[PDB]
Amino acid sequence: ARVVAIISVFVILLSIVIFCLETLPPFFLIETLCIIWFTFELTVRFDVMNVIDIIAIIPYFITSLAILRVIRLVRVFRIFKLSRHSKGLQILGRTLKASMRELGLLIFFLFIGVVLFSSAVYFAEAGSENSFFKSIPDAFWWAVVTMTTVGYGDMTPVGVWGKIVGSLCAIAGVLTIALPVPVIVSNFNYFYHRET
Template sequence: MAAAASAMGWRRRVHLWLDHGAGDDPVANAIHRGLILLICANVGAIVLESVPDIAARFGPAFAALETVSLVLFTLEYAARLWVAPEHARYRALPAAQARLAYARSLPAIIDLLATLPLAFVALGLGDLRTLLLLRLLRFFKLGRYSPGMASLAAALHAERKALFACFVVLMGVMLMTASLMHLVEHEAQPDKLGTIPDAMWWAIITLTTVGYGDVSPITAAGKAVAAVTAVLGLVMLALPVGIVATAPTKLLVLDQVDFRALTARSPKLAAHIRKLARDA
């Protein structure tokens, strides 16, 4: 019984260290700063490895860094699975279900993919160079340690339906403009706009305001369609930008409303929160 309580105490402590719930705890700060430095070093090494001269000169150092990183990231993933029952979102679940639910979350999936190169190499299924994309996924682990990225992710999640609607509208506009361009230009440029799929490439490049210039209209009707498409492209880009830009403000307002409603129901809680704010 005492051993089980001790294990749960350590699990709680490790959870606070990993999720930075221990305030200014030096161990938590050291772990987070060390992991951030390790992730940055990994991404930098992956980029530098693509330069032949640097790879030839520092190859052994890059290999050593990769090996150490894989071991540490694997230990981190295992530790996060172990402490998953302490997470507020999974605390009501049994330990096994909590760990399974955490393993299905996006941060856990990124952590797992960051450790897969070790398994592949151990099984002889490929060398580290062929697993470049899996190694680069470690960059997204930084999102766990950045409040700004966490806020952006929350904003994107809150506005996911509106953003998906924007994507659907973009696909519809692309299809319509591509069809129009095909109708007016297929005889003049059968090699470039002879089919609707060919015209869809031109449409998406124009709507996104990239404009490579490899395909352009040469007829008067085609130029008119291109002009309208270019203007629609500005509108299509402005829609998601406006949605994402206003999302944090909406979340802040909702949080304030929830806080006011909560404190109105419990004046003692409001007084306690104000006291904590003064003492902070």
Template sequence: MCYNIFIVETVCVAWFSLEFTLRFIQDRSKLAFLRQPLNLIDVVAILPYYITLVVDSTSKGEKRLGSGNSYLDKVGLVLRVLRALRILYVMRLARHSLGLQTLGLTARRCTREFGLLLLFLCVAIALYSPLLYLIENEMAATQEFTSIPATYWWAVITMTTVGYGDMVPRSIPGQVVALSSILSGILLMAFPVTSIFHTFSRSYVELKQEQQRVLQRRTHFLLRSRMAGRGSSSRSLESDALFPPRGAADAVRQGKA
């Protein structure tokens, strides 16, 4: 059913594999090359295709997946997980996208700010969830919050987004608690935003300047190579004029004679 898509994926994976192999061969430090995050993403994105081919070819004569054999069921689950990892092909755009590179560099530099944000959210969720659960169980006519862990889900989607509406407080005190959780979520999300924004803008400027320096080096290298080629050709002409070959020198001598 997906034969055409399989052909397109085969061509793309072959191209990615060739590119990765050539970059791995020409790199001097193989271990440092494999430690780079983007190269690891390339490996994780390319390997599932080959593993899927091997497993499919070896399990052709076996029973159909999901037919009661626990081993084959596990293999089928692994195959589905590997096929889902193909979405990592999108991460290859980070090599050519300045915005994605800036996003990754910002996330790496702002680990402390993200950790503080998660800490603030966890503390607020741990405060509001039991409070709302107790209020709703005591005062609401219909109980939508079955447990405190279920109320955690409500607190997460309320403090980080606008909420899904699947769990809503019915009592007036519960709605007051929900309003306070919404406002506190907005404030908590706003605390580290300024630092993250400044880091993002600084990282973007640094990466852009680095790209400009790389382009300047390439242009200088091309200009030097062209000038060197022209200089070598002019030097060869001067040397031919000063020291002509034997045949030309003999012809000149015979003409003079």
């Protein structure tokens, strides 16, 4: 039984590897053997895990450019089949389910902050002949990187008022992200301790 789980983990990792290397600038045969093993384990088994197992085989069987791009993207959900064997990943999923409202609150706070600071920086920088931000939508990426402290990169053309707005954005993002996490973290600690 444990050998079968080892084989399944090996197949999952091999599928992930082959997907990454086929995206590099044969592979189809290995993918076919992976999908045969996936459907064999699906049939033997026959929940969120079952749904993930269903999704891991659909893009293989299905095969507009947008539809092809979408199916290739959803093909990556093989990585979530590790939840059957990994116990920490199950804990993470349980924690996300038990802190979905807090996740929504985080997304709402980020949305409010990003729209506010994007409008602020766009209007503060619109008083120059050469404008760094063409529009408020053009500044959402800047606002999200400043609030997440990821960093925009080159901020030289931005003027003094834009820099003040950016400093406020950095501080506010730090605060508004530090607020709702020590609830998701507490749920994760609870679930992780309960499991082990």
